[PDB]
Amino acid sequence: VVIGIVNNTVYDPLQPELDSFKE
- For a copy of itself, the binding residues (CB under 8 A) are 18, 21-22
Nearest CB to a copy of itself, comparing residues 7 and 15:
15
Rank residues 11 and 21 by Cβ distance to a copy of itself and give the closer one: 21
CA distances from 17 to 5, 8, 11, 14 (A): 29, 21, 12, 5
Give least dist CB 22 to a copy of itself, A: 6
- Which residue, 9 or 19, is less far from a copy of itself as judged by CB? 19
Specify burial of residue 14 (Cβ count, 10 A radius: 0-12, 13-18, 19+). Answer: exposed
